[PDB]
């Protein structure tokens, strides 16, 4: 499974909608610090996913620019991802919100900021991780 | 290779048309009693590859709202799906028909029923499989 | 990893332009003679990268109906594809050329002739590889 360029950014034609889902799978390297994935719209990052292993934390925010949103970090369990350990990433976009689930299982929900759907046509994922596939 | 979720449903965009293929591999669960991939236009399956291991067929139908249509089951050779057996799914777009190859080898063409390729742009993949993999 | 059909054709929805990356991983069989990556524009071939084991170069090229212009060969460094060897391609879309890494390292540029990038909105693989993955 040849990994993908880091970081790697794609275009989403058409952009986001209810029942759209992005797929991502790939490996946490063994000392991975920190990670993201970032849905954006033209110089805003609508969605930033940041799992952190330094902090062992499961950031995610929003920029409008240079500014950042206020931080969510509530999980229901424990930190999903592990160092050296494979991963996929389950992005399902609804009318108010998108629902994340790690490997399988649902993790938590993000209610839109940038709720101009169709707009948000753009995918990057860079950090501490070997990126095998994606699916948008 | 991490699985999809299932049942997996995505949009086609621009529909098809002639030369356009889908592609996609996976595995039969061990005791799959059937699985299906539907290739939807708005409310309608324009259609329906529904392998039944319970009958050890393969089915292909069409559904236009409520209405399923007359079913097509022959084949050329015996049933190309296993259960606990990987498998691949190519479906190639032309002008008149969909022509179906398992594994490699062609295996059956279905006439098309709704014409207007164009707005044949879902698919939805659900069933007694773990599905590996999708190229639309 | 099941294998994608040889040869492979799909339609690069938007055509390409700056930042857009085509991405593909395979195998080169084991007696390979040649095999090639096309990015075609309706009846042309915009860019055409043609490994040769037989000749043991990386031949690009472009041609416009039935003319194939003048060839590039040049590498910085030995030949990176091998028989029987895995392999990964990348693609860089950018405003004056391409850029094309192989197995993630850098190999060569090709100054764009076709510069009308969105009119490139094909993609054919074929030749002697086994096609195992492909990101548009
Ligand atoms: C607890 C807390 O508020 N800490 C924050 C850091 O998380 C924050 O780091 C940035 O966070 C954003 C997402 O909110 C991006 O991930 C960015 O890359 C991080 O640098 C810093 C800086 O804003 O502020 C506090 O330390
Ligand atoms: C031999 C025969 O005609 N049997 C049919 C069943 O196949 C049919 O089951 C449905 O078939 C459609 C496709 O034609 C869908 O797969 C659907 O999910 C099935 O339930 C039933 C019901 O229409 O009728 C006969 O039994
Ligand atoms: C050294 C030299 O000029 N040799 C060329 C061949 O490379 C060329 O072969 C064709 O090359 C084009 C790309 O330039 C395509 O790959 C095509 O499939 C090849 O047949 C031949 C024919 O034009 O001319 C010289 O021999
Ligand atoms: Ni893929």
């Not at 759209?20 to 799978?25: N, Q």
């Not at 050296?84 to 993790?107: M, N, P, R, T, Y």
Request: charged fraction near 15%; include cysteine.
């Amino acid at each position: 499974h040849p990994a993908y360029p880091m970081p790697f950014i794609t275009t989403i034609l058409g952009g986001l909608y209810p029942s759209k889902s992005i797929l991502l799978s790939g490996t946490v390297l063994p000392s991975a610090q920190r990670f993201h994935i970032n849905l954006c719209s033209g110089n805003h990052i609508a969605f930033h996913l940041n799992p952190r292993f330094d902090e062992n934390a499961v950031v995610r925010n929003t920029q409008i620019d240079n500014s950042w949103g206020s931080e969510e970090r509530s999980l229901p369990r424990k930190m999903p991802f592990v160092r050296g350990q494979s991963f996929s990433v389950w992005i399902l976009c609804e009318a108010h919100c998108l629902k994340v689930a790690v490997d399988g299982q649902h993790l938590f929900e993000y209610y839109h900021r940038l709720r101009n759907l169709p707009t948000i046509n753009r995918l990057e994922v860079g950090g501490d991780i070997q990126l095998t596939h994606v699916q948008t």
